[PDB]
């Protein structure tokens, strides 16, 4: 992911 703001 590039630009993630919600981790799994």
């Amino acid at each position, epitope marked *: *992911v*590039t*630009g*993630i*703001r*919600i*981790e*799994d």
Partner: antibody
Amino acid sequence: EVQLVESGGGLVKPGGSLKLSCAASGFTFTRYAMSWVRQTPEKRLEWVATISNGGSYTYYLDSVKGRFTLSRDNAKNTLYLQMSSLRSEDTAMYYCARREGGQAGPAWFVYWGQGTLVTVSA
Amino acid sequence: DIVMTQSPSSLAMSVGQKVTMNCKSSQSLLNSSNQKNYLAWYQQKPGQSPKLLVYFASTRESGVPDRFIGSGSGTDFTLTISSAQAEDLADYFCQQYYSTPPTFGAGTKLELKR
């Protein structure tokens, strides 16, 4: 009943430090990304910074980079915006908001707080 | 850094008349993979915080009045208020969330026509 309470904003001199807190209620704080958006005296909406739900990845406005530090506390459901080296361009109303959309990229904000007023002046 | 252009800055309206607002971006907010435009609309009464009206160009938020209409694609977007009401006299902002940073427009004031 989502609720966002901002505090910590006040009158500060140029170059001084100030930290804004944002308490969140009515929803699961760990499931959403939180953001700060400021509105200038000229009524211009200006996004400041965005932090992921786990706090690992932080995104800041370019003009503010290196001076504002975003910090999240998922144990107390509180968002913290550290502000250092404050300039007379930073005096604005600072709004705490809850990001929407997916895991990646920016998104719209449904719920906003009432906002803290920050006035930078000598 | 995308530039949002709102037209016009002020809007003179009469109660019950259809109202149209324009918003243009320096980039295409169209994601060809999901065919969805990345543009939101906010309303702000004086002394209050911005209230979301329509996101994804045309998708209306829950609770928002049905008279608000979101339309447009690519670099051009429109907010439409069919049968405008005196409660709708406010500032309106458009925001893109395609790219980082999130940018807003200058805003469009809705004023009463006299």
